[PDB]
Write a protein that binds this ligand. Structure first.
Ligand SMILES: O=C(Nc1ccc(C(=O)N[C@@H]2c3cccc(O)c3C[C@@H]2C(=O)O)c2scnc12)NC1CC1
Length: 167
């Protein structure tokens, strides 16, 4: 039993809710919240900008030190950093950004990072300002992630479309 509430069950291990991931993290304080990161951990907009704003920029400060030490992530890769006031840990995962021409096949590699964590609160990777089709992202999630994932979808209209079209 866990504290995630109001989710629709899509499969054995994947759950979905119309929710603001920031507000959901604040309320649940999950072990892991996933950030929709870029390789530079520059949390300017989208989910990343919102998560970072909710940490009062502490996520960005920590991220800048990480990059200065380690260099950029790979597209499809991830790193574990602090969850600050939102979660125990933040798993920063880089999905391909279609508006940069990155290969969408890398989306499966990106979701594979979730399998290193037993339970996660997450957005749909490569959705929103990353330019991918969210219906496709949900399909890859379901077909790749084997651990327990709670997906927060900000847009109510998109949430309803994702549920109604789910196979
Ligand atoms: O801003 C947040 N939280 C989140 C921000 C961005 C996102 C995000 O990238 N969503 C995508 C998006 C955005 C726009 C059009 C779209 O078709 C899609 C597909 C995805 C979706 O619809 O979910 C999310 S997902 C849960 N939470 C947040 N909190 C602050 C109080 C405002």
């Amino acid at each position: 039993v866990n504290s995630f509430s109001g989710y629709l069950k899509l499969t054995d291990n994947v759950y979905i809710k119309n929710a603001d991931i920031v507000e959901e993290a604040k309320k649940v304080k999950p072990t892991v919240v996933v950030n929709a990161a870029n390789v530079y951990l520059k949390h300017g907009g989208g989910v990343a900008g919102a998560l970072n704003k909710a940490t009062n920029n502490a996520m960005q400060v920590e991220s800048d030190d990480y990059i200065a030490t380690n260099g950029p992530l790979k597209v499809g890769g991830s790193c574990v950093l602090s969850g600050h006031n939102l979660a125990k840990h933040c798993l920063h995962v880089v999905g391909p950004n279609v508006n940069k021409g990155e290969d969408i096949q890398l989306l499966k590699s990106a979701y594979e990072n979730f399998n290193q964590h037993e339970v996660l609160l997450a957005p749909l990777l490569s959705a929103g300002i990353f330019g991918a089709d969210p219906i496709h992202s949900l399909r890859v999630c379901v077909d790749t992630v084997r651990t327990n994932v709670y997906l927060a979808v900000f847009d109510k209209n998109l949430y309803d479309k994702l549920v109604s079209s789910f196979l």
